[PDB]
Design a protein around this ligand. Sequence first.
Ligand SMILES: Nc1nc2ncccc2[nH]1
Length: 158
Amino acid sequence: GAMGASRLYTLVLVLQPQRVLLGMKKRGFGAGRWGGFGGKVQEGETIEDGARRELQEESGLTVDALHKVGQIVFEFVGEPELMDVHVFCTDSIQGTPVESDEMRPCWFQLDQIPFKDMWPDDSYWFPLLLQKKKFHGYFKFQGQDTILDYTLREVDTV
Ligand SMILES: Nc1nc2ncccc2[nH]1
């Protein structure tokens, strides 16, 4: 049958040559995991404007440019709506990260990426992001821990 409907999300990784900024989600879905900054795209909002807005809301940072690096679709058993996540990266930041209601920020060295406390899917696509390779992925989850199926491919255009 038809693919489920999807809600549009952004995810921003602040990735510098030696380190990445991650936020620990303090409450709600995925609480206790480190990850990038993002959220739902709003009505009438361009995807990149939503990415910038969510980065500022969750981390306090504003940035010059955002680069498209991949797309990941998430599906959860028992929920018919998919998450269509557009992933971006930025290197040049202005300002200092601030703890928000949603996120507590810490920098991680790129030989200390905290996979054990990140979403399981990150082990598959985060290495591609570090290699500056664009990707499309899909992950079906049972709950927050178990992957039942996934696809992943390198692309030349997000
Ligand atoms: N990396 C990553 N973030 C996520 N957020 C919500 C659901 C699944 C997720 N995987």
